[PDB]
Structure 1
Amino acid sequence: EWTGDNTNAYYSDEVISELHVGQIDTSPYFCIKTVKANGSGTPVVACAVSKQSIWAPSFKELLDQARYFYSTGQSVRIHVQKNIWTYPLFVNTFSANALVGLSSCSATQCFGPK
Structure 2
Amino acid sequence: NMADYNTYQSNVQINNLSYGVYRSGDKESQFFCVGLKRGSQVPNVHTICKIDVFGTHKQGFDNMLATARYYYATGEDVRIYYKENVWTDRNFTAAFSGNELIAITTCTSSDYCMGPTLPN
TM-score higher than 0.5 here? yes
Structure 1 runs of 4+ off > 4 angstroms?
Answer: none
1:111 aligns with 2:109: no
1:93 maps to which residue?
95
**What residue identity is the alignment partner of 2:21?**
Q
Instruction: List alignment gaps of at least 5 residues for structure 2.
Output: none
Q: CA separation of 1:54/1:41 partners in 2, compared to 1, >3 Å: closer, same or farther? A: closer
1:76 maps to which residue?
78
The alignment partner of 2:60 has SS state of: helix
**What residue identity is the alignment partner of 1:113?**
P
- Give percent identity, aligned residues only: 29
**What residue identity is the alignment partner of 1:52?**
F
Let me know the Cα RMSD of the aligned residues: 1.9
TM-score by length of 1: 0.88
Instruction: List alignment gaps of at least 5 residues for structure 1.
Output: none
Task: Tell me if structure 1 keeps the 8 A contact 2:36–2:42.
Answer: no
Q: Deviations over 1:70-110 (max 9, x none)?
A: 00000000010111111112101110000000010111200
User: Partners in 2 of 1:73 and 1:50 — Cα distance?
Assistant: 24
**What residue identity is the alignment partner of 1:22?**
G
1:20 maps to which residue?
18
Q: CA separation of 1:5/1:38 partners in 2, compared to 1, >3 Å: closer, same or farther? A: farther
TM-score by length of 2: 0.84
Q: CA separation of 1:53/1:86 partners in 2, compared to 1, >3 Å: closer, same or farther? A: same
The count of residues paired between Structure 1 and Structure 2 equals 112
The alignment partner of 1:28 has SS state of: strand
